[PDB]
Design a protein around this ligand. Sequence first.
Ligand SMILES: O=C(c1ccc(C(=O)N2CCC(CCN3CCCC3)CC2)c(Nc2ccccc2)c1)N1CCC(CCN2CCCC2)CC1
Ligand SMILES: [Cl-]
Ligand SMILES: [Mg+2]
Length: 192
Amino acid sequence: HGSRRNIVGCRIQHGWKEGNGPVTQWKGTVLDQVPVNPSLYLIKYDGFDCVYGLELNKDERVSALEVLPDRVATSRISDAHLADTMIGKAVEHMFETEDGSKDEWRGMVLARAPVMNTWFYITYEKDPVLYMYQLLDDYKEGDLRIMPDSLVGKQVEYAKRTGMVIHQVEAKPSVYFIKFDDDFHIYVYDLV
Ligand SMILES: O=C(c1ccc(C(=O)N2CCC(CCN3CCCC3)CC2)c(Nc2ccccc2)c1)N1CCC(CCN2CCCC2)CC1
Ligand SMILES: [Cl-]
Ligand SMILES: [Mg+2]
């Protein structure tokens, strides 16, 4: 009935059209495939640090999906001990604004990212979606300071809106990834 190759670990490009807007072009890297919903992929789009969830084969807003011949480089971590003990910790993450002023955001390092092995999954208190950064390099730069059964498959309802729990964070088993309807962000909540 039709068999194709898997796209996890591959870089892709596709067109995007929402509403009466024009078709825009995008490049990205497919990070993983959700077990409790294999149609849902986690993608890191070129030039942005949020991890997004899209059904790249069923979403009618997607067009001209192609797989690139690019091979994501398998670099070596410059500091395995720091990379290992940093996971699961609360952090202060320094960012830079327009005027050059510095914003500092409370976050938590969740895990090492797949496919891009020098990047880290991280979420923030005032922005609880899934982010990806090369945290070891910010740490050396001095912009990162470190501080001292599964619900996957269930649905969660919030009043601000329904989503599904798609992943349990290993280092913090009460923290889960949630994919909400009609929102391509991956939310990171503590479900207690
Ligand atoms: O460049 C972005 C950015 C990104 C995405 C977005 C943003 O929302 N999008 C951009 C790309 C995404 C790909 C998914 N589609 C791509 C094809 C299919 C679906 C989705 C949409 C954004 N939007 C924007 C830009 C200008 C004016 C109005 C809206 C902006 N930044 C700068 C860094 C900042 C960091 C915030 N964290 C710092 C500490 C804690 C929070 C985030 C915003
Ligand atoms: Cl904060
Ligand atoms: Mg603070």
